[model samples]
Target: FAGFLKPLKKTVLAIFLASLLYTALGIAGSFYIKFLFDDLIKFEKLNDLHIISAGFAVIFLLQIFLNYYRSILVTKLGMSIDKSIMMEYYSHVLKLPMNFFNSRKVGEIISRFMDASKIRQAISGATLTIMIDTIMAVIGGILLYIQNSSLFFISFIIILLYGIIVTVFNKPIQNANRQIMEDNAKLTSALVESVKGIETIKSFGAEEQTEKSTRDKIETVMKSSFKEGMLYINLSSLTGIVAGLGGIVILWAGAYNVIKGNMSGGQLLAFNALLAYFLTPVKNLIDLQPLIQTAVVASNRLGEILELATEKELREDSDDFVISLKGDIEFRNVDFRYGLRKPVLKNINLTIPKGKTVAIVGESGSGKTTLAKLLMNFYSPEKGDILINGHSIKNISLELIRKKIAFVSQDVFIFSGTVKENLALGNENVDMDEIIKAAKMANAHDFIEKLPLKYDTFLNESGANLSEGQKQRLAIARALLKKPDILILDEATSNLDSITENHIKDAIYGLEDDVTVIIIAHRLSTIVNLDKIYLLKDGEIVESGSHTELIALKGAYFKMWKQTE
Candidate 1:
């Protein structure tokens, strides 16, 4: 409201003044018509035609001017409200926690936020308009009583009864509209998921499965919408009936007064015309009730989402961040679980000094990835502290911690942008020289240079435009460009062919000095040159030493190497 207040106030005040001017013109025109009827129609008096025509023209011009003014105010108000609310919604969504995404569907979130502008308008200016219109009807009714007691009494009784009928429709309309909105959100979410998983559906030969599910969702939405519409019509039908009945009652009373010689034909005609002025605004206000109720339902839903707790970034006093290659890490008696029963990692002690390459070898489901997440501070250990250079990991800000380490995971997620854009993500100051150097180190530069657009080529979702080997190399290149003090590659070359794997291995051998590297791989040949090896079984480290030391010991590491070879 503050953003648009000065401009809108000027516009709306102009509109209100214009409406009042029209109201004055209407009163003057009505008085002139009464004068002509009494002076000219009766006693065979000559009419002042010029005076009556001038009054009619003034009324017409005032109405046209008022309409043009009001439209400008309402439109400006709507646009301003939409812009402010959408910006706030986006800002809130960005701050929300990673876990927040797990709780709500994207469609539901979009629907609620998108409809917030309508709710704001309805609650603000639209409600005020309805209130003013209602007030006008009530004031006009009182004026009618002073004009003619008989017609006034009859119309009052009809209006009282109509009020009772319209009041009953509010609850049902609100409930039905809420149901329809919820169903629509659910249907939209299902449609989005269906499209996103199109490849999975095709692979399973489940087109019929997807079709049947989507059809059911659409039918549910249709049924809900139909119910809401029928309820609205039901309320509208009752209002129409009451309006018709009220008109009939007013007409009968007015006609009877004329017949009894208590009122003249001209007075009866004027009274009936004034009576319509009262009922017209009342009818319009009643029609707006359903619209107001629907907006209320939508607003409540949107406000609920806006009220969700946003993600709090870790911030603490910490100049303790050494910001160099002093990469000492420790996991002290760590124990963790996904939830209550299923333990993924158990008590263990380990340390990796700065500037050393450590290979973590584990079979599938042996908690290798969980350990990587723990090191990254993605999850805090339930029973242990992850000490970075002897400082507790959680004590430092997550952003600060992320800045010091680079992760190239097995599941490489490439955004839809140019190759250079991906490489420049961590360090925006990076140029083509830096990107090409990093790509060369990851053995990705040759393939990237062969592309039509080279560094400017846009990749599809999940890097579908590139081969698996190419995508993995790009992921590696992206990580390398960060120039991180610590680098962790979780099976970074898992999807590559033997020839491509050899190239990547050769690149890995040519690492810079004063950098810590952790390679989690199942392939023994890939990590044979590591300074140390940790072989994991279930959740605990079964063996730890250099490749030659573990092999000489003839333990779990030896057995796995023998089986694979």
Candidate 2:
């Protein structure tokens, strides 16, 4: 939060300059009452009262207009700071490792982002008010002392007592603010989860259960808020009483001095005006303490994300084009696990030479998809090395590695956009001819052409209007359009009917030796004509051979094929 202030220094300095001008006008206005009562009325210069009145009106109007412009500047400053901080936070989140997203819920991440705005409000609004008010208080106090020291001395003591009262409650206020922040985050998380799972809740007919849970969460938040309010309620009441007493004491002392002729009537009147300027700001400073505490807690919450270690540097060398894939990949003695759970993959060793098509067939939970993710560098192997073209993948730049490979998996995600925009995701530089070619190859161009808007059709949330198979075909077209050196299809055709699947498989086979294709599938019939196949069982490869050779052996692959048949 402190580092974010550097960019805002110029705006903040401008705000302060405007505030000082306003303050100087304010102090000057406070003395107009003295001139009106003393020089104009006391000496019976009644004709000049009109001039004094007009001067007062002009100063008052200037203060009001100055304040109007200051408010505008403050709003601009706040907006600028909000955008800068949001961009910085989002960029940092993008650079973090995949495990960070897996560990936190979507709602929790969004809650932190919302909380960040509270920090901007604290810095721009509350801090600015405190700075300008403190200056006014100080200058007003000096003028009061020059006019009458006795009254000033007594007023200063009362202010000191108010400061002591604020100090006594500061810690408790912060404690309550922290609890409020936690409760609000919990409520937000619950609301987001319920919305995301609305379909499941309706399907299960569990509206009663969900409603009960929501009510309980609402009650929790209400109770936390009540506690928070009570702390400030008591403090505000006590401070109000103290400030009231100080005002009365100042008035009492002023009246006594006037009776003794130690202070003129006009001086006593001006004394009270200056005291209002001084004490009002003092009171505002006390009120701003809670806002400052909320910001402190918000900063700590935001800091948790900013301080996490991001992914290691993948591009250290000056040359970005030095690494390119020749399609060779090897996994030597690889091991992986999730937390303390059982191993997901162990002692995995395999090699896929350049331009070879390999198939991995296995039962469910046999680590087929995890193996593909390892190649994509989604997770690092716990024990061994993965090499591409004889160079360790850990040494290669992530951008280069990702550019040379493309993965189309079972769960297809279609962002809400036009058909052409989705197809051009990876191949942003490709022309319309290439998009049509890839879509035609993936068996998608016909159906897309039939739509009312054709390639310009808008897909609502997750492409809910399209069937599962259609979404998968779009994903396949996207990967093909990328035209990487290596392409991995993890059960990419599982959602399609036999007719569509066959058409897509023919398109994939058309590439032949030009592209390295690794297929992770349970449907062995699709990959029977591939260059090679590896049969995995319990994270270990039990057999490796072509379809005819493996069938002759009558091993795990043969048994799995018979089951499917």
Candidate 3:
């Protein structure tokens, strides 16, 4: 939460100068009140009442100008501060590795982004106003003392009592607030799950199941909030009693002296008005205790994300010189698994040449996808090394490795954007010409032109507007636009029709001289013009040979390839 002050430092000089002018009227007007009651009002002068009346209106008039102006400066500053923190947090989540997101729901991750807003609001909103209160309280304390009265001591009694009251029930309040935050996050995750799976639910007649799950989560949130909200009422009402108690103590102390003939009516009225000015800031200050606790709870949730190391943070520097990769990839005796799970790959010594097309085929759950993802450097092997060019992957940065290698995974993700925007993805240099060229090569240009806006047509999320085969081709077009030295296709064409898929195969095969291509094929296509084939079975490379060599042997590769096709 202390990091929230970083934005304030950048903007504090303007705040300090501007905030000083706004408090000047309040400090001066109190002395003016003493002048009014003592000099002319007691004398019963009719002309003096007009100056007092006019002066009071002018005080309010200028107060409006400065108060409104001051609010204009700080309130927007608060939200702007929130925007910057959100961007930083979102950007950090982007740089985090894919493994970090494996078990997290999309809603849960997004809830952390919203958590930043509460932290930002506490510091920039509550904390900033408290700072201004500090300024006013100091001036009020000094000036109230200069009046030379016993009631000045009475002011601190309210401050001390209110401070003690604020510390009460905070432990219970904190626990309840913490529970409610978690409950809310879980409820959000449930809502997202149901919404994302509406089609699954409808097809299975599982509406009651989803409804029951959602309502259960909603009840949990409600239960936590009930206790949290109850705690809020108890504390707020208690603070309200203390606020009125402060008024009572002042009335008794001030009224006693003026009746004794020891203090003038004018002086008593002036001090009554003056003491309230100082006491109310402390009153407002104590009300921040619950918000402070809420912010602290939010801050703890946000820290869980911030503490995890990003992918870039774990890598070595100095990789740009090695950017000129020939796309020679090799896996040497690699053994791997996902966090104590059963081995997905073992003793896998395989290689793809600098410029050649190779295909690895296996049935589902045979680790074909895992083996291909290894080349993308998503996970390091538990044993041996993965070599890119001549250097082990650990030696060259992941940044360089990924840039040299492009992956078109089986999951064809299409985001909400125009057709060209999806293909270019944010590459400032990639023009429509390059997008059209890549689309033509991927055999998607024919479909692109048929859309209402052609390349500029707005596509819905996950390619909801297009067929599965169209979505796959658009993703291929996206990857082809990168034109990596090494390209890995992980069952990326599983949905394409024979005419469209065969054309895509020809388009990819023609790039064999310039690009090293690796295909993780689920379907065995004899028309695939590849140089080598590796048959994977049960997490091991079972057979390795060219198509003609395997066909000639009539062994496992021939049985799997020829018979399967």
Candidate 4:
């Protein structure tokens, strides 16, 4: 995060200059009490009195102007920092290994990011004010010492007590705010899950269950925040009491010094005015406790994400020669399992020749999709490695490896975007000709033509406006537009009508001319005509051959095929 500050040195320098000037004007204005008491009142200089007051008024106006721009400058720089950190966080998050997302909630991730932004809010506003106020306090201390050391002793001793009080509450305030932040993120995550799973809740009449869950989280946040709120007010009120006592002591002492002829009336007036003004910054520095604690906690949380290992940094392979993929893929003695569980895939040895089509058929828990996920480098095999185009996947850059292949998984998630943008994904320069070609091949063009805006139509969130099968077709078309060398379609046609599935199967099989196809499915009908078919069961490859050969053997595929009949 500090790295983000280097680029904004010029902006920060401007803020620094403004802050210095603003503080100087404020301190200089504190001396006007001397003019009012000693010069105008004591000497009876009535002739120049109005102009002197006018001059003091002008000084106050300049202080206002300087403080305004200084605050504005700090806020502007804070916003710039916020935008940069957010972009960096988002970019780094997506680059994290896909497995990081598998066990995390979308709502939690979003809320944690929002928490990171609080660092900027505290640093720019509350933290900066603390710094500026400290500077004023210190400068005023030196001036008060130069004016009258005996009087400075009382103010100095009181401020020392204030500092001690602030330090004493540090641990409790930090602990309290950290809990509130944690529970706030939990509350936000639960709410988001509630919305996402609303269909499940309503279908099963679980509204009360959801309400209770959200309320539990909401209740924790409210109680803790209120508890911390009372702490801040109590601390602020204590500081208020200290300031009031310091004022009383200072006024009585100043009057005694004047009567004893130790200091003039003007010096007493000036000293009183200076301490009165210094009272605000001193109190704020104490009250800024929770904010500083929040920012420290936020930095740690934000640091957790920023320090996560990214897949992009796993460029261990230095063989930088450019070679177009032949789509030859192999799984070599691969064994994988989710953390500390039984193997999801076991002893898997398989290969697909360039431009050959294949099908991996299995029951729902048979690790069929897991095999394809490994090939795409979503999760690395624990025991062995995968090879792409005769080179180990570790020897290729993630960007290049992903570029050569495309994966379409089930339960298609369509982002809220225009149809063209959805199809293009990250390719801004995608030609309309290529878009329509891909759309037509997947049997999506007909329905897309019926949309209100054709290709420019904006789909609702999660593609709710489209039917499930239509969303699947859009996913297929989106993949087709990539022209990837290797394409893994995992139950991509499950939601389509039988005729559209047939059309998509033909389009898929026709892709054998240039693409290596691997289809994972429970439906047996779509597996026909593929160059190879492998049936998996209980995390092992139980049978391997073309469709006819498997059917002729009268084994697992034969029984599975009969069941589909």
Q: Positional deviation of 49 in candidate 4, in angstroms?
A: 2.5
Candidates' lDDT values, in order?
Answer: 0.75, 0.82, 0.77, 0.82
Predicted candidate 4 versus true structure: per-residue lDDT over 1-565, tens digit per residue: 2776667788677777776676677778888888888888878887888888788789889878877777887777777877877788888887887767887778778888988767776868547856676765666778888889999999887888898878787777888888898889889889988898999999999999899988899999999999888888878888888888988999999999999999998899899888754666777767776677888888787778888888877656546774666657788888887677788888988887777778888778888878887787788778887887778877776777678778887869899978888898856787799999999999989889987778888889999978898889999999999888888898998877899999999888776557788888777888777778988888788878998899898997888788888
What does the lDDT read for residue 292 in candidate 3?
76
Model 4 scores what on Cα lDDT? Answer: 0.82
**In model 1, where do residues sit more than 4 Å from their true spots?**
1-47, 110-167, 257-278, 313-326, 339-341, 426-429
> Considering TM-score, where higher is better, how would the candidates rank from best to worst?
4, 2, 3, 1
Q: What lDDT score goes with residue 374 in model 3? A: 72
Model 3 CA deviation exceeding 4 Å by range: 1-14, 17-21, 31-42, 123-127, 259-262, 317-320, 527-529, 552-555, 562-565
The total number of steric clashes, by the backbone 3 Å criterion, in model 3 comes to 0
- TM-score against native, each model: 0.85, 0.94, 0.92, 0.94
Clashing pairs in 3: none
Ranking by lDDT: 2, 4, 3, 1
lDDT tens per residue, model 1, 329-442: 787889888656688889877788767778888889888888888887666578988877867776776666788788998878888888787777776875678878888888
- For model 2, what is the alpha-carbon lDDT of residue 328? 77
Between candidates 1 and 2, name the one with more favorable TM-score. 2
* Residue 72, candidate 4: alpha-carbon lDDT: 81
Residue 435 in model 2: lDDT: 93
**What tens digits encode model 3's per-residue C-alpha lDDT throughout 1-565?**
4466665664565666556665667666666666777887668866877887688779868865866666666777888777776777788888887688777888888776788767876766446756686666776777777774577787777777777877676789899988988888988988888888898989999999889988999999999999988988888888888778777877777788778876666676677776656777666666676777888888788778978899877666545568666767788898887668799888887887777778888778788878777777677668888787788777787766677777887888888878777887635687678888989999999988887777777878788988888989988998988878778887778888888888888888776547888888767783345788888888888777888877887877777666766
For model 3 the local lDDT of residue 103 reads 71
